[PDB]
Structure 1
């Protein structure tokens, strides 16, 4: 094969080999297949019917722009599926069908604007979905999230999100055992509406390197299981009594915070401000 072999009948790296179509001169038991940087442009029905045994698949930067129903149809054992940097624009409302075993799913920078039309709905076994560096402005998990009864990490960093509203995390209410970690870093966020996290169960929450100047008194207060939280490198306003709520909260949850949210202009830790 013009491909490379790292593990016989197991792992092939057909990377950078100018393919225009899915090879197949590769064993039928292959388990790990890297097809990154190959002008594949379109993935049509059954695009992989020759690898019923794949586990990990990489299709990073493959200029793909379309994926239709059953594209991965017989990849029952697929756990990972990296679809990074692919100018997708049309996405089959059946695209991922057949991915019964999927667990991880990178979709970094795949020109996404909203998870509303992101057909992962039936991806029950999914464990982590990274849709970082995209074009999402409003982040409002849609109903289908319900079926994501195992999702434990959801990255949404570096998008175009400027604000967190109530509704935005709603569906989670109906998710009791959800030990979800949620990353929302490097976003143009500067507004979190009150009641946003009320009655929600986040294990880890990251709101660092955004543009928050202040938050709503009690915004976290009723946030079950929260073990880690990032709030550093933000343009925090340390004026009394505004900052008060947080300054306290942090002190109360010191062990929870990672890094130290500081004061804009001051540089002084927020947790050091005792207001009158």
Structure 2
């Protein structure tokens, strides 16, 4: 009993349409203009033509994950002024579709994870004045997209995890004043510039684990709201003295699976801090060689 539907989708009376997993190559014809949510994930849509969603002016949620989408017409998404959620994960995108999403002024959540994105055009994310959540994980980015990210002061959640980023320059995230969580784990970051995190005044969670950090990130000093800091599974040998003095918001820190050099007086400050702040360390930082916990070390 779907008065406003078309084969082989379902229309669940709350103006949500489900056409997922149906072997579709296109948006089905004859769907209602009342539609508020459209799930067309897990099909075989490789291309979206112009005006593909022209008859859905009140669409709030569009699920396109798991297709094999490799081409989005610059005007495929025209007229979707109400759209809040766009999921494009697990497709064949090579480029962030900058122009096609430009008019999505109500968008709050954008999933671009698990594509094959190697580049993000400079003008990406202009027009996304309400965006809150952005997933860019599991792509092929080799750098942080600085100018495109500068367009998103409303952004709260960002993942750039599982990409190929090797360094982050000064002021890379400077306009992201609302950002609460930032994931940068599973990249190949060896170089963090001294001021790469400036302007992240609301940041609570920072994940930098599974990288190639050889030097401790001084840049973390610019994070007054920092609650959770993951630095596990890097190549860290020492921390600079007094690095945590101004991180009075810290609640959890991961330091394990790093080759800590437990020579005195180099390990002095870190050993004492870990002993005074035992409640904050998650797991155990160990001395390279012996495997003795860093907190158990004392310098005379």
Larger CA Rg, structure 1 vs 2: 2
**May I ask how many residue pairs the two structures share in their alignment?**
270
| Residue 275 of structure 2: aligned partner | 251
| Residue 205 of structure 1: aligned partner | 229
The partner residue of 1:268 within 286, 289, 292 is 292
Is the 8 Å Cα contact of residues 115 and 142 (structure 1) preserved in structure 2?
no
Is the 8 Å Cα contact of residues 118 and 142 (structure 2) preserved in structure 1?
no
Runs of 4+ in 1 over 6 A off after TM superposition: none
Q: Where does 1:1-276 land on structure 2 (aligned, <5 Å)?
A: 7-8=16-17, 9-22=35-48, 23-24=52-53, 27-67=56-96, 69-117=98-146, 119-140=148-169, 142=171, 145-169=173-197, 171-172=198-199, 177-192=201-216, 195-198=218-221, 200-201=223-224, 202-276=226-300
Is the 8 Å Cα contact of residues 116 and 141 (structure 1) preserved in structure 2?
no
- TM-score, normalisation: structure 1: 0.85
Whole-Å Cα distance in 1 between the matches of residues 243 and 193 of structure 2?
11
Q: Quickly say closer, same or farther: Cα 1:267–1:63, change in 2 above 3 A.
A: same
User: Structure 2 regions of 5+ residues with no counterpart?
Assistant: 1-5, 18-34
Whole-Å Cα distance in 1 between the matches of residues 250 and 298 of structure 2?
24
- SS of equivalent residue, structure 1 residue 119: helix
Whole-Å Cα distance in 2 between the matches of residues 5 and 266 of structure 1?
63
User: Structure 1 regions of 5+ residues with no counterpart?
Assistant: none
1:141 CA displacement: 5.0
Q: Quickly say closer, same or farther: Cα 1:252–1:26, change in 2 above 3 A.
A: farther
Question: 1 or 2 for the larger relative contact order (CA 8 Å, sep ≥6)?
Answer: 1
- SS of equivalent residue, structure 1 residue 260: coil
